[PDB]
Ligand binder design. Structure first.
Ligand SMILES: Nc1nc2c(ncn2[C@@H]2O[C@H](COP(=O)(O)OP(=O)(O)O)[C@@H](O)[C@H]2O)c(=O)[nH]1
Ligand SMILES: O=S([O-])[O-]
Lengths: 187, 160
């Protein structure tokens, strides 16, 4: 009925309020999994609002973030391909701690979907954060003198459980981001 | 020049960056990634990043900001429960080889709050008088109004 469309608008206006309304009106079950499924489908939802909700520090929101990541399939994708898919489903917040939690959750799922590509989830998480830093450096106009490949390779030294990642991997990621920024999501 | 801005969560880093965005005449098209703002003056520019916060990513900012000339540390002047933790985190930053030549600007933020520690109290509780080989300055601020922000950046210009 009309209540669902109202809840979506409320969500866009203030995510926690939209969720409150949908739960109170028995249109959405109050579990992390059901909220995540709602956000992943994203029907009539603003991707900035989705991202803002997924980025909140609260226990429920963190559980929703993990359940949301669980709905993504990253098998047979390289790291940048998987990040592009993930970051199309919501607008990444700018606050570093929100990005950090999102990249750690992403990395756990990436590694499960692609066993053996990275030797630890920490390596994947740190590299993913590094890729966001690269997109920022290369494509944020506030940053004047862009990072070359050599400098990006150097930025990642030591993150492979104390050692280095293959140069060819870092080159492939660098080239992909340089050629195509992470797209500003359309909803 | 690139400048790293750090501080405990909720210190006011995002709020500071948003105010700095408003002061600029150059408007910027949205990008995916970290909050970064360039403040442009005639003879100097500062590109301030919020990109720290967790230990496992410290190598990335150590490398990106290697040999950088300034560091901004933001503290919530009202958070007496976490001031010791802020001091410990500041001292970790100041022990990093990569930031050895950086001057330190401390924004003692949230001075609007009625029980906020004053500048002298923050200087004491962050251990700033203990620093030997560091040029440092404490700037009282209220990030929600913008007061103190350009004054602190002026000092940083006057060191750089
Ligand atoms: N009263 C007061 N609140 C502030 C001030 N600066 C930031 N805040 C608030 O403190 C909270 C955390 O600020 P934020 O910029 O997100 O902190 P960050 O986690 O360091 O980025 C927000 O609710 C801000 O509105 C200030 O000077 N005074
Ligand atoms: O979290 S905000 O700065 O997009």
């Amino acid at each position: 009925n009309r209540k669902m469309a109202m809840g979506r608008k409320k969500f866009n206006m203030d995510p926690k309020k939209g969720i409150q309304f949908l739960v109170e009106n028995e249109l959405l079950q109050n579990t992390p999994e059901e909220i995540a499924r709602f956000l992943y489908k994203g029907e009539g939802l603003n991707k900035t609002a989705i991202g803002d909700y997924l980025g909140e520090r609260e226990e429920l929101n963190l559980a929703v973030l993990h359940a949301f990541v669980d709905l993504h399939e990253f098998t047979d994708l390289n790291l940048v391909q998987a990040l592009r898919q993930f970051l199309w489903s919501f607008r990444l917040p700018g606050k570093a701690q929100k990005i950090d939690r999102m990249m750690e959750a992403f990395a756990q799922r990436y590694c499960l979907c692609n066993p053996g590509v990275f030797q630890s989830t920490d390596t994947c998480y740190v590299l993913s954060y590094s890729v966001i830093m690269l997109n920022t450096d290369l494509h944020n106009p506030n940053v004047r003198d862009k990072m070359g490949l050599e400098r990006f390779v150097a930025m990642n030294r030591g993150i492979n459980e104390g050692g280095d990642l293959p140069e060819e991997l870092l080159r492939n990621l660098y080239d992909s981001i340089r050629n195509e920024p992470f797209k500003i999501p359309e909803d | 020049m690139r400048i790293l801005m750090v501080g405990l969560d909720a210190a006011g880093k995002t709020t500071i960056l948003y105010k700095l965005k408003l002061g600029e005449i150059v408007t910027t098209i949205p990008t995916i990634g970290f909050n970064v703002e360039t403040v442009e003056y005639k003879n100097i520019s500062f590109t301030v990043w919020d990109v720290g916060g967790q230990d496992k990513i410290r190598p990335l900012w150590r490398h990106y900001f290697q040999n950088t000339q300034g560091l901004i540390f933001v503290v919530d002047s009202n958070d007496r429960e976490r001031v010791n933790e802020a001091r410990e985190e500041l001292m970790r930053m100041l022990a990093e080889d990569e930031l050895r030549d950086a001057v330190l600007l401390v924004f003692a933020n949230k001075q609007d709050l009625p029980n906020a520690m004053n500048a002298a109290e923050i200087t004491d509780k962050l251990g700033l008088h203990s620093l030997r080989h560091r040029n440092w300055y404490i700037q009282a601020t209220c990030a929600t109004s913008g007061d103190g922000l350009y004054e602190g950046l002026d000092w940083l210009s006057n060191q750089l």
